[PDB]
Amino acid sequence: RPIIAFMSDLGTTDDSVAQCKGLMYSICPDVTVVDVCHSMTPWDVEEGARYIVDLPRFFPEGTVFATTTYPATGTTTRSVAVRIKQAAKGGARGQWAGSGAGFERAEGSYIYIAPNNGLLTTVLEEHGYLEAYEVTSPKVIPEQPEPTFYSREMVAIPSAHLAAGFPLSEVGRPLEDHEIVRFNRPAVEQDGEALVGVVSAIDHPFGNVWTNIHRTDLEKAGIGYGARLRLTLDGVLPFEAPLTPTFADAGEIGNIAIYLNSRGYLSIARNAASLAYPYHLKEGMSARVEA
Amino acid sequence: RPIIAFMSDLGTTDDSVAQCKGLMYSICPDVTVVDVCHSMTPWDVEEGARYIVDLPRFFPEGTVFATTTYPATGTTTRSVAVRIKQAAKGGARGQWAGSGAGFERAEGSYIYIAPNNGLLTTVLEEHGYLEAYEVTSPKVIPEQPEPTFYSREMVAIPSAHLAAGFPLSEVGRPLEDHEIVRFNRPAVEQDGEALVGVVSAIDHPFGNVWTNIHRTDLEKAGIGYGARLRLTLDGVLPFEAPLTPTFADAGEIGNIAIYLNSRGYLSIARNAASLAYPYHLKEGMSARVEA
Amino acid sequence: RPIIAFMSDLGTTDDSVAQCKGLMYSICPDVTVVDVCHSMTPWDVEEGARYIVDLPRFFPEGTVFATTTYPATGTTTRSVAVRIKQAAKGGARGQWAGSGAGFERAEGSYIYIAPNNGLLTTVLEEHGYLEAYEVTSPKVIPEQPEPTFYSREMVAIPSAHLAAGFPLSEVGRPLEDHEIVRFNRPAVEQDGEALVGVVSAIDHPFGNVWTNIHRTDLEKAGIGYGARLRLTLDGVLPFEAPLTPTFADAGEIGNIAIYLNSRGYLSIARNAASLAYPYHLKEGMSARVEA
Amino acid sequence: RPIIAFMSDLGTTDDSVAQCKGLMYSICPDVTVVDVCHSMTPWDVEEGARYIVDLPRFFPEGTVFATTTYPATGTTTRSVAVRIKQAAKGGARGQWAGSGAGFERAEGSYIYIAPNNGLLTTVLEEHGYLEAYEVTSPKVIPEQPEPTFYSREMVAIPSAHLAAGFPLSEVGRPLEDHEIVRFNRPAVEQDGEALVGVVSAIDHPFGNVWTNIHRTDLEKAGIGYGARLRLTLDGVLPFEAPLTPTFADAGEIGNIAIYLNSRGYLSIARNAASLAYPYHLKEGMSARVEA
Amino acid sequence: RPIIAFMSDLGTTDDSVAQCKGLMYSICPDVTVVDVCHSMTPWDVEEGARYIVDLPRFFPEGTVFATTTYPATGTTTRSVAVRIKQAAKGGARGQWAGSGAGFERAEGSYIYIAPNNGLLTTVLEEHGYLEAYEVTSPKVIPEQPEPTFYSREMVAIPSAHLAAGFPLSEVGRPLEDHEIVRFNRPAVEQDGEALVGVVSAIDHPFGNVWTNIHRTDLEKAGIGYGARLRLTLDGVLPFEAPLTPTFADAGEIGNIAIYLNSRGYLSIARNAASLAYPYHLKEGMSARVEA
Amino acid sequence: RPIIAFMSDLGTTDDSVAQCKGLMYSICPDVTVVDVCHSMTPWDVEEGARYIVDLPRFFPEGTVFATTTYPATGTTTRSVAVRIKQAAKGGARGQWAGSGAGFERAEGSYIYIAPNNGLLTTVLEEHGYLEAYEVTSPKVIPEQPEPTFYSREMVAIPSAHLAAGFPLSEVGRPLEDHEIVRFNRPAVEQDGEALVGVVSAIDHPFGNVWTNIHRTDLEKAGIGYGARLRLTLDGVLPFEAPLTPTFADAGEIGNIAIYLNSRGYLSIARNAASLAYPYHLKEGMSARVEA
Ligand SMILES: Nc1ncnc2c1ncn2[C@@H]1O[C@H](C(F)F)[C@@H](O)C1O
Ligand SMILES: Nc1ncnc2c1ncn2[C@@H]1O[C@H](C(F)F)[C@@H](O)C1O
Ligand SMILES: Nc1ncnc2c1ncn2[C@@H]1O[C@H](C(F)F)[C@@H](O)[C@@H]1O
Ligand SMILES: Nc1ncnc2c1ncn2[C@@H]1O[C@H](C(F)F)[C@@H](O)[C@@H]1O
Ligand SMILES: Nc1ncnc2c1ncn2[C@@H]1O[C@H](C(F)F)[C@@H](O)[C@H]1O
Ligand SMILES: Nc1ncnc2c1ncn2[C@@H]1O[C@H](C(F)F)[C@@H](O)[C@H]1O
């Protein structure tokens, strides 16, 4: 019962994703295709990375992740297919997902296939990898690929072959580590006592504000649950609240909650109301936190 | 071939729904996950209720409905799992769904699992229930649930256990009727000869106007197809048309149609044009109808 | 392993598509339902046609295409079910889809079911057909169809019967060619040396501009890759670039690319930036191209 | 103490109006320049006409009206200067303006100077004229007029000469009636018992709705104050109210008032709330009224 | 050389203000009409009050203030004309306006004429008055006033008679204090050490934030220039800055300044950047200040 | 009959301009105050400069220009008052303004008073100056200036004293040329045969596009009326048209006109339609022209 989990920038306003899916079912008739999301800002590899980095612990072992924004479509570039090492714990605390104590996942149990454009940067950082190959074999890609549709030709199609049991090491030559393109992750800075980062995302549809300041950055500064924080956004808008596990800890509906989100990052919200939308807060705004 | 039909407020702009789905396939490998919708206004339990109340007659017996907006995530609250009684006929006329005379559904054939926050109010009103339990067993929920993701921990995960055949009565203790939270449904008033209600929804993507005035309210006042109606919206827009089965009965494109929608409620539209969008008509505007 | 590929105007903001899907799984328990898209402009048959015409070569033989915008819902009209002839090659070059040399598809291998309102015009033009029937049998549609939901009653339901192996010729009487409604496709004009057409679509989410000027129209005028073109939009915005296979051929990010899209049509874009959105370019604007 | 009343399409976002005013004070040092308005939709002669037709009865005898939208700037066209005949009563009732019984104005007491492009159509209809001349003398216009600024060269400048006492008949040759350009005023139609016109303006900043249905059209159909009217806008939105003199006659704040505006035309509003803005009502929408 | 300073809700998008001005020049040929502003939110008497309360010290003695929003137009209501007592100092410090030590203004030197609807509430509070009359004489208003234009009939017209020297006490009968309508001014509360008020206005076009917390409220709590303040907006934005005289005192462009505005009220801004516009801050949001 | 022509960033949404005007009439009772405009983007000295540089030739000799955006309000900075040298010809051709051959203006006939922040940069470039003084005397400014209102205290007030005949050289000490702050005017570059500049302004309310490419730049490259030009905006929207004197020379309504505007600069428009608004063209976009 193979699964392909599919993340693209193709949208859901026409038949583009469906063309990919038709080919996936053609190649691997028993496959289940699970949509991750298709609404990422086109060509924003850092955003795409956020939608795929946390996936493995949630999925059955053997799942293939087909993950693509492909602005270099129709060039001599070729996709990378990697078998990751650690499925990796996650969340506010760092745990396995599932009922009971969670579902522990075996190492080496997931494949990602993507443009070699840095989309897999955080996947490789957080999970490591056991093997990586350039995707070139005409057994798994078209001999004559559609120039403007490499997300289909060089990701969707070969992902379905991999789901069907095509040997990963036969997709093409092995890639050395330096040949796998990475984007630079801007660091969270210490600035005296304060941590200085950025709003990584507006958390739709709630309008919560997610920062790139991780639990580990907070722990490094001695900030734990209960600490009274001043969190300043965009250089201008300050908020003040204690760090709490969840939204309802802020008390009344509309009150500010500062918390660790389900991906492990410092975040700010209103309790059962939107923070971001009324004040037009945006990704890329500065985020400074201090006790 | 178990089915989980999944309705949430998690959106389709990131991997949140996919994390839930991964766990569903982990727990119940043979499951089919059917998206109901994920775009409800967050925390609007009355809107969520509208998206789930009409579902049972359309689905195979044994379907599990995983339905969630979870503003009390991370608190001591626990979900409710209920086996409904009547699958219930529906539509403008009140019938079974499907070809021929429709698919008759057996009683006691569907389970809903939801936050205990009133989301199931109309489900319980229209279908009744045979049994209801608090969802507490660590066999079906995490021992250490993610504080900000109870839609996953307390709905998605246990729904998959239920779909896999976990006995409903083993999820936790039985709930008495008064322990199942309800929202108040404002009634349709008789006001002399007129029926007085509200616009329950703008029917996207068409911009039809749906009211909370049901067929049964119309029947009570003697109003049937062919009756010349005056339907006043927002206190000031007195539209006049006969009640007709469908949009084309209004004649020319753009003309006003007053009709019974597919959920059994009095509605108003233009024939193959949008009523609501040009005039910015809104949910919560008053709706008065009279012969 | 039957597949139904489902394209509607029902949106993804409520349970409407899910009601259709529940019935599809009820009728054909082994089916896979693949969403094409549900976000087309309601009642715009020409737009719907664009989302369904290219599908067959991507899907396994035996796939049923359930394709619907149904403004004549609740009238005496009945759907048409057709078995197409040629699956048809496609793309910028005209080829089979898939890995290697592509997946050759047998003739007569796909069924479309749709309102008989011209939605299938381009399907029939590009693929031909072997047989066409009016959908009337109460074995495949409701005896008492919901007046305002013919997309469910007269498309979704009978599509599932067809996917389950109900004989196509038993759905109702054969239709003569003249009884299958067509929309008029406005032609691309030659105007001296220039080709004169329209913007057929803004290609979301990228904001590329797609025209109705086909590869075959370009070939007729001797225009091939490398030709320096002047492409004028809306009568007044001229652009100049060579015809290239893909976006990156324009060089620097933001530069103009004029290319053949993956559906075989002359298009214009910026390289990894949006052309249409900053300048509010729109479907229906004139498009003139000349060497 | 001469007055120039100045209406243009030049806006108030730069120094354009001030350049005109500087020249007016240069030519006629004792002049008072009164702004009518400068925010008309550029080139919309019918809208400009509405802002100038009602002016004369309000101003001291001898006032010059400099009124201009000049899309034919820099062509061989020349402005028209006219001395009107009747100052003309106005309002809901048809009266002189001012305290007591009002200020009766002598005939032949006002000059309009405008592009000869139909801007003065309604001025001439409602007031008549005694004499009209083409504005060509280099004593009152530049010998070398700025091509793109005829509103200054051919209206503002010569208006100041006229205000200073330059003889009207010396500005250039007399114009015959047929040489004075007119726009066509679309008529109010009788359609059975109903009057069928258009929304002539959204009355900013209040969002009242003004129609082209005049008091005289209402009188012709026997409609007077107290008559219960059904007024339908845009073919779709009906309203019902009695015809009243003013807004407060509707009773509660927000209630619909149907009234005669201060220019003599049938209008619709909410009492101390905006009608047009919440429903996005627009100029050019149809307006049908019936008893 | 009489002056009428004219504040209305009539806008500057048509000839309405000009009709008023024409009549003013008709009645008082030597008058100078000074526009205060015409863009107030219609019917918002509290906003109108803010635009007129600070005026007297800036104008020559004998100036008439014609100030009007007239939602009760066409009713039996009549305007009030008042001679104020103290011209009153103003500003951040409380001083006369002008060069040197400023222009000292004599008592009893200004007349306001307005609808008797509370528009003059703050004028009377801050300046006091010596005499007040109902405006009823047909020597100064029309015998047959236009029902929908009392801002012209009952304010503009009689203001011009007053400017021309018509005796104030002859406009109609004297009004007792209780017959002059007032709106309620919500007070600034002391709440422990903090002062609790509201954002009175967004200061356009800069987007500074003006509160109803006056210098005198600050002085009462011992707060002077240099005091480190915490100013919380909307319950959740706790800005921190010293109280400074001006914007540049915040240092770098964009930094927060907390200051006393030119009307004497506690305000917050960014230095040469907009505070309110990026964050959509609004009038009516709470404003709490504390040392 | 003195004139003050007043340009500020104070807007027209409250009484701020009126406070300034009241003081101007207080100081100089016979003055005429002419509004230039009050809607400039706050603190944008380059934009303010565009609204004041062309004024002198239009106004009577002796006019005082009070021109202000004052972001350094409340600091030790003081305004500059300058007597300009040449009134300077202007327009597409370079001429005097007015009827006949125009009104020749004597040298040394206009005074500007402004913040010393570079607002007068282009005034001084295009007109030169005879004398410049720092504005410090308490005879012409307040002894205790309102910290946040220097546009009133240090521009409006002293302008009225200057209009009233206060000797310019007594306002304070003479300023050396290097003490008068200037902004840098980016040059128009020659780039092979092409001229490379920027869109200096969107010409509201028409949506014409004004560039910083002057007649003199065109003359330098041999470009005169009749030359076929390619004008490229924003790097990517090319237009092609001959250089013509005016809009109507483009022929049909909506056609592209490339012309010299009334300020002497290369511009592009549509004939009696908006160019900028439909395509959201903006100030600061690149503008390249070539024959
Ligand atoms: N204007 C553009 N420039 C660069 N890439 C584009 C593009 N429009 C779409 N794409 C890209 O083409 C990919 C396709 F191969 F699948 C999509 O995934 C893209 O991101
Ligand atoms: N793009 C355009 N096309 C035609 N006329 C225009 C224009 N832009 C401004 N105008 C016109 O030029 C006049 C001027 F002579 F005073 C203005 O009154 C205009 O309406
Ligand atoms: N700002 C907020 N306040 C309260 N609940 C929120 C929230 N943002 C998201 N949620 C809620 O978290 C749930 C999650 F547990 F699944 C979502 O279903 C909720 O709507
Ligand atoms: N829809 C409306 N309801 C109440 N008053 C209105 C109105 N529209 C305009 N006004 C009012 O009419 C006055 C006029 F007499 F001068 C204006 O000053 C008012 O605000
Ligand atoms: N206001 C309207 N007028 C005409 N058709 C409409 C409509 N609103 C929805 N529809 C149509 O009803 C169909 C249904 F039967 F499935 C949808 O597919 C529609 O296109
Ligand atoms: N937030 C702000 N920061 C800097 N200057 C400002 C400002 N708000 C208004 N101004 C400035 O204050 C001046 C005044 F003194 F007249 C106005 O002309 C301003 O440009």
Q: Which of D19, D131, D145, D125 is nearest to D78 (CA)?
A: D145
My answer on whether B58 and B181 are in the same domain is yes
Rounded distance, CA C226 to CA C289, Å?
Answer: 14
Contacts of D280 in chain B (CB under 8 A): 278-280
Contacts of B39 in chain A (CB under 8 A): 205
Please check whether residue F18 is in contact with residue E35, taking contact to mean a CB–CB distance below 8 angstroms: yes
State whether the beta carbon of C36 lies less than 6 angstroms from ligand 1. no
Question: Is C286 assigned a ligand-binding role in the annotation?
Answer: no
- D-facing residues of F in 94-153 (CB < 8 A) are 95, 97-103
Identify the closest residue of chain B to D239 by CA–CA distance: B237
Please check whether residue A17 is in contact with residue A35, taking contact to mean a CB–CB distance below 8 angstroms: yes
This structure's resolution (angstroms)? Answer: 1.8
B221 exposed, middle or buried (CB, 10 Å; 0-12, 13-18, 19+)? middle
Indicate the residue of E14, E22, E148 with minimum beta-carbon distance to D246.
E148
Please check whether residue A187 is in contact with residue A28, taking contact to mean a CB–CB distance below 8 angstroms: no
My answer on whether D113 and D134 are in the same domain is yes
Count CB atoms within 10 A of the CB of residue D137: 17
My answer on whether E238 and E130 are in the same domain is no
My answer on whether C208 and C75 are in the same domain is no
Single-letter residue type at E50? R
My answer on whether C176 and C192 are in the same domain is no
Pick from E9, E37, E73, E154 the residue to mutate for probing ligand 4's pocket: most ligand atoms within 8 Å of its CB: E73
CB-side exposure of E30: number of CA atoms within 13 Å?
Answer: 8
* Residues C1, A30: C-beta atoms closer than 8 Å: yes
My answer on whether B239 and B164 are in the same domain is no
E68 exposed, middle or buried (CB, 10 Å; 0-12, 13-18, 19+)? buried
**Touching, B vs A (3+ Cβ pairs under 8 A):** yes
Technique used: X-ray
Indicate the residue of D38, D58, D93 with minimum beta-carbon distance to E144.
D93
**Touching, C vs A (3+ Cβ pairs under 8 A):** yes
CB-side exposure of A149: number of CA atoms within 13 Å?
Answer: 25
Give residue B70 CA to ligand 3 midpoint distance, Å: 5
Rounded distance, CA D266 to CA D218, Å?
Answer: 8
Interface check A65 vs B, CB under 8 A? no
* Residues C247, A143: C-beta atoms closer than 8 Å: no
* Residues A74, C100: C-beta atoms closer than 8 Å: no
DSSP code of residue D142:
B
Structure tokens at B168: 């409903």
Indicate the residue of B240, B254, B279 with minimum beta-carbon distance to D237.
B279
Which residues, including other chains, have CB under 8 Å from residue F19's CB and lie 6 or more apart?
E54, E55, E58, E97, F152
My answer on whether D9 and D150 are in the same domain is yes
CATH number at A153 reads 3.40.50.10790
My answer on whether A253 and A179 are in the same domain is no
Pick from A70, A75, A117, A146 the residue to mutate for probing ligand 1's pocket: most ligand atoms within 8 Å of its CB: A70
Rounded distance, CA D3 to CA D64, Å?
Answer: 6
Bridge partners (DSSP) listed for residue D203 = D208
My answer on whether C170 and C56 are in the same domain is yes
Please check whether residue D275 is in contact with residue D281, taking contact to mean a CB–CB distance below 8 angstroms: yes
Instruction: Please report which ligand is nearest the Cα atom of F272.
Output: 2
Interface check C88 vs A, CB under 8 A? no
The counts of H helices and E strands in chain E are 7, 14
Residue nearest to atom 9 of ligand 2 (CA): F206
State whether the beta carbon of B70 lies less than 6 angstroms from ligand 3. yes
Final residue of a domain: which of D164, D185, D206? Answer: D185
Which residues, including other chains, have CB under 8 Å from residue B167's CB and lie 6 or more apart?
none
- B-facing residues of A in 147-206 (CB < 8 A) are 201, 203-206
Final residue of a domain: which of A128, A156, A185? Answer: A185
Contacts of E8 in chain F (CB under 8 A): none
My answer on whether A66 and A167 are in the same domain is yes
Indicate the residue of A27, A42, A146 with minimum beta-carbon distance to C91.
A146
Single-letter residue type at D282? K
CATH number at C268 reads 2.40.30.90
CA angle E120, E124, E125 (to 5 degrees): 120
Interface check F22 vs E, CB under 8 A? yes
My answer on whether F159 and F243 are in the same domain is no
Query: Best mutation site among E12, E15, E77 for testing chain D: the one with the most D CBs within 10 Å?
Result: E15
How many domains are contained in chain B? 2
Question: Is D14 assigned a ligand-binding role in the annotation?
Answer: yes
Interface check F215 vs E, CB under 8 A? no
Rounded distance, CA A250 to CA A227, Å?
Answer: 13
What's the longest Cα–Cα distance across chain A? 61
Query: Best mutation site among B4, B8, B26 for testing chain A: the one with the most A CBs within 10 Å?
Result: B26
Interface check F11 vs E, CB under 8 A? yes
Binding-site annotation, residues of A for S-adenosyl-L-methionine: 9, 14-16, 70, 151, 203, 208, 262-263, 270-272
Structure tokens at F279: 């395509």
* Residues A92, B147: C-beta atoms closer than 8 Å: yes
Instruction: Please report which ligand is nearest the Cα atom of C206.
Output: 1
Which residues, including other chains, have CB under 8 Å from residue C190's CB and lie 6 or more apart?
C196, C221
Q: In chain F, where does DSSP find H-type helix?
A: 16-27, 45-52, 121-127, 150-151, 157-163, 215-220, 276-279
Rounded distance, CA B92 to CA B290, Å?
Answer: 19
* Residues E240, A238: C-beta atoms closer than 8 Å: yes
Single-letter residue type at C36? V
State whether the beta carbon of B68 lies less than 6 angstroms from ligand 3. yes
Quick one: CA dihedral C250, C255, C261, C262, positive or negative? positive
State whether the beta carbon of E249 lies less than 6 angstroms from ligand 6. no
Q: Which of D177, D215, D171 is nearest to D195 (CA)?
A: D215
State whether the beta carbon of A206 lies less than 6 angstroms from ligand 3. yes
Pairing outcome for strands C189-191 and C129-134? unpaired
Rounded distance, CA C4 to CA C13, Å?
Answer: 21
Q: Which of A249, A256, A251 is nearest to A275 (CA)?
A: A256
Domain that holds residue B37: 1-185
CB-side exposure of C59: number of CA atoms within 13 Å?
Answer: 30
| H or E element that contains C190 | strand C189-191
Q: How far is CA F278 from CA B139, B193, F51, F238, in A?
A: 60, 51, 25, 16
Rounded distance, CA C199 to CA C281, Å?
Answer: 9
| H or E element that contains C216 | helix C215-220
My answer on whether A171 and A27 are in the same domain is yes
Final residue of a domain: which of D185, D210, D235? Answer: D185
Rounded distance, CA B169 to CA B171, Å?
Answer: 6
